[PDB]
Amino acid sequence: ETVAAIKTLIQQLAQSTDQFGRAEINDALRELQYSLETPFDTVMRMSLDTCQVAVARIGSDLGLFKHLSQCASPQSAEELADHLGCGRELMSRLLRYMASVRMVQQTDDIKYISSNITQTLAVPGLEAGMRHAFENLWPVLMALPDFLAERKYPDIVDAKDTAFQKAFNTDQDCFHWLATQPTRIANFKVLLTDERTPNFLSTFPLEKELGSWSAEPEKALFVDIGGGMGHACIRLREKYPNQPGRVILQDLPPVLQAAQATLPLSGIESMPHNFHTPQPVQGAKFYFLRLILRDFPDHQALEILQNIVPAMDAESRIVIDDGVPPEKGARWAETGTDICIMSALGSKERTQRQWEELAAKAGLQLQALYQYTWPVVNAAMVFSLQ
Amino acid sequence: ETVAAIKTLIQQLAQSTDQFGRAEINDALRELQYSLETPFDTVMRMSLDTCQVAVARIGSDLGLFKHLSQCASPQSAEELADHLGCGRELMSRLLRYMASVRMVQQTDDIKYISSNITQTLAVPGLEAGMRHAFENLWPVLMALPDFLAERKYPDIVDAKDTAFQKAFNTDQDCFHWLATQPTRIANFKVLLTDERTPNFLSTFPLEKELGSWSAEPEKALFVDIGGGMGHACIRLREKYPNQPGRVILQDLPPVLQAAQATLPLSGIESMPHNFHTPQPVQGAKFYFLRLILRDFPDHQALEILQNIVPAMDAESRIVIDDGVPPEKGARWAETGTDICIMSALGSKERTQRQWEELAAKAGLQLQALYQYTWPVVNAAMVFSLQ
Ligand SMILES: Nc1ncnc2c1ncn2[C@@H]1O[C@H](CSCC[C@H](N)C(=O)O)[C@@H](O)[C@H]1O
Ligand SMILES: Nc1ncnc2c1ncn2[C@@H]1O[C@H](CSCC[C@H](N)C(=O)O)[C@@H](O)[C@H]1O
């Protein structure tokens, strides 16, 4: 059949390229889908695609993805239902739906095996992002249209006056509201254990950027500001095991104690630091900010940069590792993020020119930009004092 | 470039087939996307694809899609913002996101024109379907995971005990509650103006099913039970304009009122009738139920059928026009519908065997099954007395 032939050739093209080529193919397949659906199909697609997150959250509550990924033969719906404690008819209907969207696979004797998506949802860090989206993002998006209608469609600029405050009936911003929320801290801390791949070290020419700087007598090579579990520090020490200089993970105390389990015995310091205060480490080569500034409106993002600038020597650099969407033709993964951080945080995705304008207000100029993902661009941008 | 070549060749294959083949290709493109995405891509897709309904809702509130679909030239974001009463920065970011998911088209000089999806969302009945998804379906899906956990995963069979009651904090079932909400019933009435295509008359062998039936003296040929705007009656009269016999649209008076604008001035009777009460028309050739019975659990669906059966002749037929999902390999459109109607109405999609089991409890037997859509199957099922 022509359908089998299409799948075979796209599969073969996909395996004949790298992860960025496969991402480009997937965006093309998505664009083809939208161009080819009928009007009624469009409305059905938009209506039913919301089911995926709800049904993933149920499968996660039942432990279904973890169980199915460990099974060694196809499982019947009754076997899964009786094992996980689910009603037989309910489980059979959830599995039929999951099979239709490849969350599981259905065999021709109507049994079930894991798919690539089953394996994904069984990973704690990824499972946690799905649960984050259901419990924290969905309420904000559900509130955005009426929030904007009430306020007469304002440009959102303040983290304490956006859809989040209407959706959760609070007056705090996300950061502070979450502390008051037991169940959501546990999922968030699990979320921080996910490590995105690839990372900036795949294209960052660290030796070229070192240049005229010296680690002697005891200077810091790398200060990871808000570095979470410290994945950037770990990958840096791993890739450049012979480069001298302190490598310092900076974050809040509760996150730093969680990171102790995973950090190496030696080579990475843990330093409690609130990045809304002056940077304590002086003259470091790289002050590193990964997925930090995108969570803040320009006013607060600027204050974070101004808190680092007085610690910089002439050879110091601020490295912002973040999304850099293009000026036109932006893709859904970076425009969707923009709407979400608008609605929850009052912040925004920034083009290269918007990053430069923000950094110029802190006294900085862009020296170099090292993309490491495509077609949705994440880049390490290297800034020095003007 | 490979991506351009894939789009060219899929587009050419799509143009060469019919709507059923294009739907087959679209399901295959979806399956390829899901198998080719990375684990991180899966979570981002699940997370962000719900932005689409939220942003469509906003563009609907602003009249954006209706406006853009009437525009004779590309519009800048500033021109749209100022025309529609939206903040310029807000409108720019919404348009960028809409273009990235083909809800509009962005030009090379960063202006905006209608896409196929813009035109769809400008259609009142299709727009109303999207607004229904946002305001009615979304809160029920949002409530389903916690509802199932509280009741430890029951099999849902009661229309007054499902996620709908939790989501809207009421003890009414969905049908009664909707009537007490003026803006929601108003949207619903616009929703009824959308006419699905193709319809059952494309494969229904009317003359063979009629045989020698005579309309003499006063008999009805076609009774459209819960017929809405009467599309099935209108199409029947248009395709067989010389077939004698009355054609009767039965619904509740508020819906029949909205139908008068569209009905032909002669040939179709509007008869108020509650299908939970005994059927007034005796001895009709066809009692027609399109997309009625899937809205009810088996007990209440049985009673609707039992209200008709005493009116039937030996020649009378009940025609159920509804989804007939396969025993295996069902598609996302028909399984996702099953999960939505579970959560909001306590009902279910039914396989052919499940329809026959239900209809036998009313003393009916299946005589013919006429599919008219593929690969998601809708069929007219013709039942007679045992
Ligand atoms: N005021 C503050 N001072 C220092 N760290 C903060 C902070 N507010 C939030 N954070 C931290 O900022 C991080 C945001 S997510 C961390 C992402 C990390 N840079 C990475 O790419 O791996 C969290 O670890 C959180 O604990
Ligand atoms: N108790 C009742 N008696 C008669 N009609 C009812 C009813 N409850 C709901 N309805 C009607 O049933 C219809 C369901 S949707 C309409 C579907 C229609 N058969 C078609 O496909 O074209 C609505 O028009 C609604 O007004």
DSSP symbols for A225-248: ET-TTTHHHHHHHHH-TT--SEEE
Q: Can you read off the two tokens belonging to residue A357? A: 């304008």
Answer whether B64's CB lies under 8 Å from B115's CB.
no
Strands B220-225 and B286-290, sheet pairing = parallel
C-alpha B22: how far from chain center: 19
Tell me, what amino acid is at A377? V
Name residue B323's beta-bridge partners.
B378
Instruction: Tell me whether B348 touches chain A (CB under 8 Å).
Output: yes
What are the residue ranges spanned by the domains of chain B? 2-122, 125-191, 200-326+347-385
Cα–Cα distance list, B12 to A28, A32, A35, B17, B337 (Å): 15, 11, 13, 9, 31
As a whole number of angstroms, the longest Cα–Cα distance in chain B is 70
CB-CB under 8 Å, B52 with A145: no
DSSP symbol at B155: P
Preceding amide of B124 cis, omega within 30? no
Ligand 2 centre from B228 Cα, in Å?
A: 5
Q: For residue B135, with 0-12 CB atoms within 10 Å meaning exposed, 13-18 middle and 19 or more buried, which class applies?
A: middle
Write down the residue that tokens 């016999």 correspond to.
B245
Q: Can you read off the two tokens belonging to residue A353? A: 């020119």
CA distance A381 to A368: 6
Answer whether A101's CB lies under 8 Å from A52's CB.
yes
CA distance B76 to B82: 10
CA distance B137 to B144: 11
First to last CA, chain A: 63
Interface test with A, best of B15, B42, B168 (most A CBs within 10 A): B42
Sequence-ordered strand ranges (E) for B82-169? 105-106, 112-113
Tell me, what amino acid is at A219? K
Q: Can you read off the two tokens belonging to residue B95? A: 């348009």
User: Would you say the C-alpha torsion B52, B58, B60, B62 has a positive or negative sign?
Assistant: negative
Answer whether A371's CB lies under 8 Å from A203's CB.
yes
Strands A317-323 and A378-385, sheet pairing = antiparallel
Burial A203-240 (b: 16+ CB within 10 A, else e): ebebeebbeebeeeeebbbbbbbbbbbbbbbbbbbeeb
Cα–Cα distance list, A352 to A294, A325, A366, B110 (Å): 13, 8, 10, 17
Cα–Cα distance list, B107 to A28, A379, B32 (Å): 18, 26, 28
Answer whether B177's CB lies under 8 Å from B171's CB.
no
Answer whether B138's CB lies under 8 Å from B167's CB.
no
DSSP symbol at B75: B
In sequence order, the 6+-apart residues with CB closer than 8 A to the CB of B306 are B362
Q: Can you read off the two tokens belonging to residue B233? A: 């009656």
Q: Can you read off the two tokens belonging to residue A214? A: 């010296």
Over its C-alpha atoms, chain B yields an Rg (Å, rounded) of 23
Three-class DSSP category at B112: strand
Answer whether A85's CB lies under 8 Å from B152's CB.
yes
Preceding amide of A198 cis, omega within 30? yes
Instruction: Tell me whether B14 touches chain A (CB under 8 Å).
Output: yes
Minimal C-alpha gap between B325 and chain A (Å): 11
How was this entry determined?
A: X-ray
CATH class of A2-121: mainly alpha
In sequence order, the 6+-apart residues with CB closer than 8 A to the CB of A234 are A262, A263, A264, A268
Q: Can you read off the two tokens belonging to residue B214? A: 């005579």
Ligand 1 centre from B25 Cα, in Å?
A: 44
Count Cα atoms within 13 angstroms, Cβ side, for A28. Answer: 20
Is any ligand 1 atom within 6 A of the Cβ of residue A288?
A: no
Q: What are phi and psi of B103, to 5 degrees?
A: -70, -25
Q: What are phi and psi of A363, to 5 degrees?
A: 90, 25
Q: Which of A286, A295, A291, A310 is nearest to A383 (CA)?
A: A286
CA distance A161 to A343: 9
Closest residue to A144, CB basis, from B11, B54, B334 = B54
DSSP symbol at B120: H
Q: Can you read off the two tokens belonging to residue A11? A: 């599969």
Query: Which residue pairs from A104-113 have beta carbons closer than 8 angstroms and sit at least 24 positions apart in sequence?
Result: A104/A68, A106/B328, A106/B329, A107/A74, A108/B328, A109/A74, A110/A76, A110/A77, A110/B327, A110/B328, A111/A74, A111/A75, A111/A76, A111/A77, A112/A68, A112/A74, A112/A75, A112/A76, A112/A77, A112/A80, A113/A68, A113/A71, A113/A74, A113/A75
CB-CB under 8 Å, A13 with B10: no
Over its C-alpha atoms, chain A yields an Rg (Å, rounded) of 23
Q: Which of B70, B133, B68, B125 is nearest to B99 (CA)?
A: B68
**A313 marked as binding residue:** no
Cα–Cα distance list, B240 to B127, B199, B204, B245 (Å): 32, 14, 12, 11
Answer whether A112's CB lies under 8 Å from A95's CB.
yes
CB-CB under 8 Å, A25 with B2: yes
Answer whether A229's CB lies under 8 Å from A259's CB.
yes
Is any ligand 2 atom within 6 A of the Cβ of residue B192?
A: yes
DSSP per-residue codes, A1-68:
-HHHHHHHHHHHHHHTS-HHHHHHHHHHHHHHHHHHS-HHHHHHHHHHTTHHHHHHHHHHHHTHHHHH
Count Cα atoms within 13 angstroms, Cβ side, for A240. Answer: 17
Tell me, what amino acid is at B273? H
Chain A residues near residue B138 by CB distance under 8 angstroms: 50, 142
Sequence-ordered strand ranges (E) for A256-358? 269-272, 286-290, 317-323
Ligand 2 atom 2 nearest Cα: B274
Chain B residues near residue A37 by CB distance under 8 angstroms: 26
CA distance A65 to A51: 17
Strands B246-251 and B286-290, sheet pairing = unpaired
CATH 3.40.50.150 assigned to domain A200-328+349-385? The reply is yes
Q: What are phi and psi of A183, to 5 degrees?
A: -65, -30
Answer whether B209's CB lies under 8 Å from B317's CB.
yes
Chain A residues near residue B95 by CB distance under 8 angstroms: none
C-alpha B219: how far from chain center: 31
Minimal C-alpha gap between A293 and chain B (Å): 18
Q: What angle do CA A155, A344, B166 make, to 5 degrees?
A: 120
Name residue B384's beta-bridge partners.
B365
Answer whether B263's CB lies under 8 Å from B230's CB.
yes
CA distance A193 to A129: 11
Answer whether A223's CB lies under 8 Å from A280's CB.
no
Ligand 2 centre from B212 Cα, in Å?
A: 31
Within 311-340 of B, beta carbons closer than 8 Å to A belong to: 327-340
Cα–Cα distance list, B32 to A4, A282, B26 (Å): 11, 51, 10
Sequence-ordered strand ranges (E) for B59-141? 105-106, 112-113
Query: Which residue pairs from A166-173 have beta carbons closer than 8 angstroms and sit at least 24 positions apart in sequence?
Result: A167/A139, A167/A140, A167/A142, A167/A143, A168/A139, A173/A345, A173/A346
Chain A residues near residue B86 by CB distance under 8 angstroms: 153
Interface test with A, best of B2, B15, B27, B51 (most A CBs within 10 A): B51
Instruction: Tell me whether A47 touches chain B (CB under 8 Å).
Output: yes
Q: Can you read off the two tokens belonging to residue A256? A: 């730093």
CA distance A346 to A294: 10
Q: What angle do CA B124, B126, B131 make, to 5 degrees?
A: 90
Write down the residue that tokens 């161009």 correspond to.
A35
Ligand 1 centre from A289 Cα, in Å?
A: 9
Preceding amide of A326 cis, omega within 30? no
Q: What are phi and psi of B220, to 5 degrees?
A: -90, 135
As a whole number of angstroms, the longest Cα–Cα distance in chain A is 70
The helix or strand, by DSSP H or E, that contains position B333, with its residue range, turns out to be helix B332-345
CA distance A330 to A336: 10
**B274 marked as binding residue:** yes
Interface test with B, best of A12, A22, A46, A151 (most B CBs within 10 A): A46
Three-class DSSP category at A355: helix
- Fold exhibited by the domain B200-326+347-385: Rossmann fold (3.40.50)
Answer whether A379's CB lies under 8 Å from A368's CB.
no
**B138 marked as binding residue:** yes
Three-class DSSP category at B378: strand
Cα–Cα distance list, B35 to A52, A131, A144, A319 (Å): 15, 21, 32, 35
Answer whether B141's CB lies under 8 Å from B166's CB.
no
Name residue A288's beta-bridge partners.
A224, A319
CA distance B22 to A36: 7
Instruction: Tell me whether B57 touches chain A (CB under 8 Å).
Output: yes
Q: Can you read off the two tokens belonging to residue B318? A: 């009940």
Return the axis-axis angle of helices B182-191 and B124-132, rounded to nearest 10°. Answer: 130
CA distance B301 to B318: 13
Answer whether B322's CB lies under 8 Å from A30's CB.
no
Is any ligand 1 atom within 6 A of the Cβ of residue A294?
A: no
Closest residue to B2, CB basis, from A13, A26, A338 = A13
In ligand 2, the atom with minimum distance to the C-alpha of B228 is: 24
Return the axis-axis angle of helices A19-36 and B19-36, rounded to nearest 10°. Answer: 150
Name residue A222's beta-bridge partners.
A247, A286
DSSP per-residue codes, A111-172:
-EE--HHHHHHTSHHHHHHHHHIIIIIHHHHHHHHHHHHHTTSPPP--TTSSHHHHHHT-SS
Q: Which of B161, B179, B158 is nearest to B170 (CA)?
A: B161
Which CATH architecture is the domain B2-122 placed in?
Answer: Orthogonal Bundle (1.10)
CB-CB under 8 Å, B94 with A339: yes
Answer whether A339's CB lies under 8 Å from B55's CB.
yes
Answer whether B263's CB lies under 8 Å from B249's CB.
yes
The helix or strand, by DSSP H or E, that contains position B332, with its residue range, turns out to be helix B332-345
Closest residue to B154, CB basis, from A33, A51, A87 = A87
Strands B317-323 and B378-385, sheet pairing = antiparallel
Ligand 1 centre from B236 Cα, in Å?
A: 65
Answer whether B87's CB lies under 8 Å from A173's CB.
no
